[PDB]
């Protein structure tokens, strides 16, 4: 295989290894809720500002509830993918070898029950992130443009 500076470099491997989807030294549920709150803070912006009620004083709650609904749909999709692909007592399929070659313990994140914890965490985190973006966009809302 080819190894360009993109796919192989100190800083890029460092960054990708630091984000929650690969730091196996944390419980999978916590990585799930972290990515969930990340995407929750993420999606509220355009959905609210450019929604079909933007010219209305309700556009805030509208966009936020829409974001929450999308988060719920995607959590449903996550659970469905997990129950489809992950069996309930069978082993894991996560990369158990690092770059050097340290034989890694099978990532509990890549297990049926682990994927379930991940899904629940992601859903709760998305809800929290959406409501937090709402409370920070329509109460304490001076230094922004919207």
């Amino acid at each position: 295989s080819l190894e360009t500076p993109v796919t192989s470099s100190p800083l890029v491997a460092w960054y990708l290894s630091n984000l929650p989807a690969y730091r196996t030294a944390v419980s999978p549920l916590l990585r799930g809720i972290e990515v969930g709150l990340a995407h929750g803070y993420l999606l509220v912006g355009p959905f609210a500002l450019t929604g079909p009620l933007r010219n209305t004083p309700v556009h805030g709650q509208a966009g936020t509830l829409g974001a929450i609904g999308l988060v719920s749909i995607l959590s449903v999709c996550l659970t469905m993918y997990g129950v489809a692909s992950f069996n309930e007592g069978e082993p894991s399929t996560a990369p158990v070898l690092t770059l050097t070659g340290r034989k890694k313990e099978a990532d509990k994140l890549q297990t049926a029950e682990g994927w379930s914890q991940f899904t629940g965490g992601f859903f709760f985190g998305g809800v929290s992130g959406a409501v937090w973006a709402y409370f920070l966009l329509y109460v304490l809302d001076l230094p922004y443009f919207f």
Binding site: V76, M80, V83, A84, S85
Partner: peptide, 30 residues
């Protein structure tokens, strides 16, 4: 009135549950 109750249900949630049920089915492996 009654349309506001039913049309959204037969448009989004009932198709959603049908799709996810058939997904689960076709992905079965006994």
């Amino acid at each position: 009135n009654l349309p506001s109750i039913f049309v959204p249900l037969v448009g989004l949630v009932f198709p959603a549950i049908a799709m996810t049920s058939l997904f689960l089915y076709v992905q079965k492996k006994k």
